[PDB]
Write a protein that binds this ligand. Sequence first.
Ligand SMILES: c1ccc(Nc2nc(CSc3nnc[nH]3)cs2)cc1
Ligand SMILES: [Ca+2]
Ligand SMILES: [Ca+2]
Ligand code: NA
Ligand SMILES: [Zn+2]
Ligand SMILES: [Zn+2]
Length: 167
Amino acid sequence: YNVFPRTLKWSKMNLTYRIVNYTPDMTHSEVEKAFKKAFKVWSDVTPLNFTRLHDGIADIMISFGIKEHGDFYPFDGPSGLLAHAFPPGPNYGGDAHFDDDETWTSSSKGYNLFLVAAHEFGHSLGLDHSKDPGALMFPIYTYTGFMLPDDDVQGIQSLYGPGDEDP
Ligand SMILES: c1ccc(Nc2nc(CSc3nnc[nH]3)cs2)cc1
Ligand SMILES: [Ca+2]
Ligand SMILES: [Ca+2]
Ligand code: NA
Ligand SMILES: [Zn+2]
Ligand SMILES: [Zn+2]
């Protein structure tokens, strides 16, 4: 027999993601690089591996949408809500949605896609919000010109372990 896990997390270390569609604001390459770097934040400190799929069903489906876009969390136009992601699980579990009424960038302007994605992927992997104002998982956007803060390291490692501690 098996009882359910005590904590919510992926039961496998190999995860896939798919960029379903793209924001007008950035090139396809810029978007891909931002998401690749955001996953690397987490894989660098765990045994997790992330592989991109171009099509089909991935664990973490990524999309840009506005207003009502297929879930119970409609976006709200410019400002306010920026993005959200679902905790590990089937279907919408793990998926990350970005409000395409925001301006997404690879700079300090607008909202930096890499930084927001790194936060959202923390949710995709099983972290909720942190009370440390300096944590990536703190629930308000700040721009930083990357080192994953220790609170986030401790949180993600509590779920998945550290992987190789010196890679
Ligand atoms: C860097 C990047 C982002 C953050 N923190 C962020 N917090 C929010 C709002 S809280 C929330 N989480 N999902 C939906 N809404 C959006 S980006 C912190 C540091
Ligand atoms: Ca918004
Ligand atoms: Ca999913
Ligand atoms: Na936009
Ligand atoms: Zn959504
Ligand atoms: Zn959040």
